[PDB]
Design a binder for these strands. Structure first.
Length: 80
DNA sequence: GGTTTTTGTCTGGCTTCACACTTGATTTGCATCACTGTGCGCCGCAGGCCAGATCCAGG
């Protein structure tokens, strides 16, 4: 991670200086969207669907109201 | 009408994914069976062993 800062510590400046001009400065989703379109150019369409399902909390993860319904409706105590 | 956005196009060509079928060969889903519990209370009990108070009939 520290060397992924050391190798991208100029392109990181490029993406934060383009983020404020193109949309306004939203640093997460612009590189997310570049990663989606990079999978499009790399031609994986199911993998990007798993990506957006994760980033909507669907393909795994289990949004915590559903886990609450599972912990409640099967008589599971909190320790179990 | 401008201004930027929002979608459309191109054809040649690249990878990427679905399907044509079939016969087992699994794996996965769902009914089916005869039942459960929540429908009310209360306190010392049960089982057994033994020293000691009753007792009751024969000498």
């Amino acid at each position: 991670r520290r060397a992924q800062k050391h190798r991208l510590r100029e392109l990181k400046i490029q993406v934060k200086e383009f983020a404020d001009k193109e949309e306004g400065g939203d640093v997460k989703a612009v590189c997310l969207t570049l990663f989606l379109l990079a999978l499009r150019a790399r031609n994986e369409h199911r993998q990007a669907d798993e990506l957006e399902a994760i980033m909507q909390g669907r393909g795994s993860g289990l949004q915590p109201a559903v886990c609450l319904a599972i912990r409640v409706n099967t008589f599971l105590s909190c320790s179990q």
